Amino acid sequence: PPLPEYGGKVRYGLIPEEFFQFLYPKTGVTGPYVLGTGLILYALSKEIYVISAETFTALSVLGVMVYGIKKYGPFVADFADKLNEQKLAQLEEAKQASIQHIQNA
C-alpha cells in the first residue's frame, strides 16, 4: 500500500494539532495556550518542577536542538527525498532499458 504524504501537523514539535481543535470549541483560540502558562506557573510555584542545575542544561540542549532543527532541517528534509527520487529513477531507467534488451531481442 502507498504511504500517505503528510503526518500529523504538530505545533512546536511537542503538542499535536488534535489537541488544539479538541479544546477550540468550548474555550476558544487562546484556550489551550493559557492552560500551558497556567500549568507551568503552577508547576514551578508549588515546586513541582524545581529549578535546579538541570534547568539550565535543559534550555541549552533544547536551544541547540531547536537551532539544529531550524538550520539543518531543510537540508536533511530534501536530502532524504533526493535519495529516493534517485533510487526511484535508477530503477525506472533500467526498467525501460530492460525492455530494449528484450524488444531488440
Binding site: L3, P4, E5, Y6, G7, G8, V10, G13, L14, P16, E47, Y49, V50, I51, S52, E54, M65, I69, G73, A77, D81, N84
Partner: protein, 74 residues
C-alpha cells in the same frame, strides 16, 4: 473503543493478559508510527514528541532526588 464509550465496565471488559496488554502497545505503537513517522515527507516532530515523552519519564523517577533541592519550604 474509548473516546466514544462511557461505562466503567470497559475497564474490566479489556483483555488483561500478558499477551493482552502487549497487543494494546503493539497496536498503540503502529497507530503512532503510521501517523507521524510512516509517511513520505514526514517531519522531525515524529521524534521530538517521543523524546518529550521520554523526558517526562526521565523526570518522573528523578523527582525523588530533586525534591531535596527546593529553594523554599513554605
Amino acid at each position: 473503543e474509548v473516546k466514544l464509550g462511557e461505562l466503567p465496565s470497559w475497564i474490566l471488559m479489556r483483555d488483561f493478559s500478558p499477551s493482552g496488554i502487549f497487543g494494546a502497545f503493539q497496536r498503540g505503537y503502529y497507530r503512532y508510527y503510521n501517523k507521524y513517522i510512516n509517511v513520505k515527507k514526514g517531519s522531525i516532530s515524529g521524534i521530538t514528541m517521543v523524546l518529550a515523552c521520554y523526558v517526562l519519564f526521565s523526570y518522573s523517577f528523578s523527582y525523588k532526588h530533586l525534591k531535596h533541592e527546593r529553594l523554599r519550604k513554605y
